[PDB]
Homo-oligomer: A and B are copies of this chain.
Amino acid sequence: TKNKMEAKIDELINNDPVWSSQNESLISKPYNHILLKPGKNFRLNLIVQINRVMNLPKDQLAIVSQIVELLHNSSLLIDDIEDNAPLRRGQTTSHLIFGVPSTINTANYMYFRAMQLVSQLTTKEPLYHNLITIFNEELINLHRGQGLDIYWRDFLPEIIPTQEMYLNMVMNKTGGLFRLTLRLMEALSPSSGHSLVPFINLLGIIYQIRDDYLNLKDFQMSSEKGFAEDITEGKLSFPIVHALNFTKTKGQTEQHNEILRILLLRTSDKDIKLKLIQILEFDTNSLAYTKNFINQLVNMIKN
Q: CB distance B14 to A172 under 8 Å?
A: no
A240 CB, nearest partner CB in chain B, Å? 18
- Interfacial residues of chain A within 102-129, with CB under 8 A of chain B in the complex: 102, 104-106, 108-109, 111-113, 115-116, 119, 125-126, 128-129
- Report the bound CA distance from A175 to B139 in whole Å: 26
A150 at the interface (CB under 8 A from B): yes
Q: CB distance A202 to B168 under 8 Å?
A: no
A160 CB, nearest partner CB in chain B, Å? 14
A19: chain B residues at CB < 8 Å are 141, 144, 168, 172
A204 CB, nearest partner CB in chain B, Å? 9
Given the contacts A81-B104, A104-B104, A154-B99, A140 and B109 also touching, CB distance less than 8 Å: yes
- Interfacial residues of chain A within 137-173, with CB under 8 A of chain B in the complex: 139-141, 143-148, 150-151, 154, 167-168, 171-172
Q: CB distance A102 to B151 under 8 Å?
A: yes
Partner of A101, one of B12, B150, B300: B150
How many residues of A are counted as interface, with CB atoms below 8 angstroms from the partner's CB atoms? Answer: 69
Partner of A112, one of B6, B81, B143: B143
- Report the bound CA distance from A139 to B116 in whole Å: 11
- Report the bound CA distance from A105 to B151 in whole Å: 10
Q: CB distance A148 to B23 under 8 Å?
A: yes
A90 at the interface (CB under 8 A from B): no
A57 at the interface (CB under 8 A from B): no
The secondary structure that dominates the A interface is helix
Can you spell out 22 A-B residue pairs with CB atoms less than 8 angstroms apart?
A5-B293, A6-B300, A12-B167, A13-B201, A17-B172, A18-B168, A18-B171, A18-B172, A23-B144, A81-B100, A82-B101, A83-B101, A98-B154, A101-B154, A102-B151, A106-B143, A108-B108, A109-B143, A109-B144, A115-B136, A116-B136, A125-B129
A221 at the interface (CB under 8 A from B): no
Residue interface bits A42-58, CB-to-B below 8 A is 1, else 0: 00000000000000000
Partner of A297, one of B9, B24, B146, B168: B9
Q: CB distance A105 to B9 under 8 Å?
A: no
Apart from A10-B300, A19-B141, A112-B143, 7 more pairs, CB < 8 Å: A2-B299, A5-B293, A19-B144, A82-B100, A109-B144, A119-B129, A125-B125
